[PDB]
């Protein structure tokens, strides 16, 4: 008997992994000089 045609082109790949967590912000500049 004649062999069949190919099956459908596969399920799409699962989504890529979620990112990890951001490095913390750089510390603030020292304040202005105090009142006289």
């Amino acid at each position: 008997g004649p062999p069949g045609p190919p099956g459908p082109p596969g399920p799409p790949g699962p989504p890529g992994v979620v990112g990890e967590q951001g490095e913390q912000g750089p510390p603030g500049p020292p304040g202005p000089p105090g009142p006289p």
Partner: protein, 164 residues
Amino acid sequence: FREMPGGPVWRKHYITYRINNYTPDMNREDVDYAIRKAFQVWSNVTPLKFSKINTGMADILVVFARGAHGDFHAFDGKGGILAHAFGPGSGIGGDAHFDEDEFWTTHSGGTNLFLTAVHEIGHSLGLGHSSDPKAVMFPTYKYVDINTFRLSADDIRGIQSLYG
């Protein structure tokens, strides 16, 4: 893993982009310059040419949105998800979506649109990820002084494995 698995690419060098809408966090000309410089980072190292258009269909749509925004990649308030791309291909393919609950910036404070757009446009070009903390296609953004920016060697290895 510096290239998309299996790997979709653009089968032409002349690529187009459209900014769908602008973020209210920034000046209009600063959103423009962030995306223009983010495309220039990638055209420096391949045969690709990148052009902004203002009506009709583009290859790459740049979009600002919040919460659920019409694909299986829903955003999530301040922090958590800040963007998502899609790989090269027709329609939603190539498109770069950014979260509007985040506060977009030109500068070191807030959320630096140029540096984020380099990674998600990198996925709009078909990049995978590096495993090196020095790479822009690493699973970790770091803030770097945008005035002196460079790709890492493992990002150049990636993009040159897909184009040229």
